[PDB]
């Protein structure tokens, strides 16, 4: 609900207008470069299904994680910036990211 990046973006992107979501990752890359990961390194998803893909390179990401003190309506987040490989699960035609599986 407040001024650091995660509090602002989680509210703006409608993640925390009606609940406090525990964790969420934002990727700071162009949409078409994030969509390009669906034809990069195929890997098994955490759930063992096989439609996950790992980016060849690291991407700029911000991890947002609720503090121990956060309670709706006052959601509060710790902001961690990092450059990590993302893993996304892809589906459809066009084969596009539908779930964020992890960053490594």
């Amino acid at each position: 609900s407040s001024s650091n990046y995660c509090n602002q973006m989680m509210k703006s992107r409608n993640l925390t207008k009606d609940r406090c979501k525990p964790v969420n990752t934002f990727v700071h890359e162009s949409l078409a470069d994030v969509q390009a990961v669906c034809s990069q390194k195929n890997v098994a998803c955490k759930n063992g299904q096989t439609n996950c893909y790992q980016s060849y390179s690291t991407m700029s990401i911000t991890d947002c994680r609720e503090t121990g003190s956060s309670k709706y309506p006052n959601c509060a987040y710790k902001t961690t910036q990092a450059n990590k490989h993302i893993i996304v699960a892809c589906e459809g035609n066009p084969y596009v990211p539908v779930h964020f599986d992890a960053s490594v």
């Binding site: 969420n24 996304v88 459809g92 539908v98 964020f100």
Partner: peptide, 15 residues
């Protein structure tokens, strides 16, 4: 209404 791909973009991409 919002597709799974649109929801992935809204929640995770910040170009």
């Amino acid at each position: 209404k919002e597709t799974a791909a649109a929801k992935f973009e809204r929640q995770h991409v910040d170009s």
